[PDB]
Design a binder for this molecule. Structure first.
Ligand SMILES: [Cl-]
Ligand SMILES: [Cl-]
Length: 313
């Protein structure tokens, strides 16, 4: 009798110890595009040293050209419009803004902000329904109110920033439409593997997309959750491609490497270690799901399949 199965370690943490306490600046808006902007049409570059990968290896590009996905960090309304434009030059299908942020976020006076709690876990433990409700109330309560927006610096604590009386409030859905992009929200928690619920929602969403749909995934930094869903999409759309090729190419176009590697972590980041290891196992577990469930068209949802086929540490 285990309390929390592999893939659900975060459930053991206490949400009450990571409540939001400040409006974090998601992007200074100085660049034309958000950080870590990348597409499946991009050329593959040398892997990062930290992952100890074979730089000489040439991963398969089978399906890359048809994959039609991209990723990036958070952004300003203007940076998103730039993304939409760049993507429109690559496709004629609907471009989706896939918001993988569980944390409450929005735009105050056009400034992209989020209600940050330690580890960005201000909405940890909440269902998507509750997280969105919190976000809706907080965004609305900020109108005509004085707010403190600041970027995080020393030890993930507010550093400088600005104070202003909000005159306009917008949700990402609104900003997404303004850029001519469809919107789909997946309330996934930062630093951890997406819950069975997050993936169940994404999978149902995937089966409904038209053939020419372009998915633009993004989170706060655009590395962790963004690469995971990019990887999942790659596996789903290109099931005949090996796990190695998938992980290598998703990494070499600007994403994170979700395979095994010497996980080195700072003393103040040691809490991340087990989550990184958990994600490596779950990545393999998802790959197994796709291989064993594509034949009948995914009749069995991920959550259900995962319960009868739990992963090992
Ligand atoms: Cl609920
Ligand atoms: Cl993440």
């Amino acid at each position: 009798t285990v309390t929390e199965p592999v893939g659900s370690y975060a459930r053991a943490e206490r949400p009450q110890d990571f409540e939001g306490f400040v409006w974090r600046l998601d992007n200074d808006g100085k660049e034309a595009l958000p950080r870590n902007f990348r597409t499946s049409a991009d050329a593959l570059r040398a892997p990062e040293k930290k992952f100890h990968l074979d730089a000489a290896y040439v991963p398969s590009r089978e399906g890359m050209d048809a994959l039609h996905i991209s990723g990036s960090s958070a952004f300003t309304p203007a940076q998103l419009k730039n993304v939409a434009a760049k993507l429109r030059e690559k496709t004629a299908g609907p471009i989706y803004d896939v918001d993988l942020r569980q944390e409450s976020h929005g735009y105050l006076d056009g400034i992209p902000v989020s209600w940050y709690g330690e580890r960005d876990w201000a909405n940890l433990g909440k269902s998507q329904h509750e997280a969105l409700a919190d976000e809706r109330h907080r965004l609305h309560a900020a109108l005509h109110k004085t707010v403190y927006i600041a970027p995080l610096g020393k030890h993930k604590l507010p550093e400088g920033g600005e104070v202003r009386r909000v005159q306009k409030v917008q949700t990402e859905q609104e900003v997404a439409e303004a850029a001519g992009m469809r919107y789909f929200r997946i309330a996934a928690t930062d630093h951890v593997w997406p819950t069975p619920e997050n993936i169940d929602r994404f999978l149902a969403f995937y089966r409904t997309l038209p053939q020419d749909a372009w998915l633009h995934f993004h989170c706060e930094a655009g590395v962790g959750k963004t690469t995971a869903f990019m990887v999942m999409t790659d596996m789903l759309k290109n099931p005949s491609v090996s796990l190695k090729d998938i992980l290598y190419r998703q990494h070499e176009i600007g994403g994170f490497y979700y395979g095994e590697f010497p996980i080195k972590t700072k003393d103040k980041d040691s809490w991340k270690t087990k989550y990184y290891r958990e994600k490596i196992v779950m990545i393999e577990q998802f790959y197994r799901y796709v291989q064993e469930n594509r034949a009948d068209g995914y009749q069995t949802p991920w959550s259900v399949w995962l319960k009868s086929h739990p992963a090992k540490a």
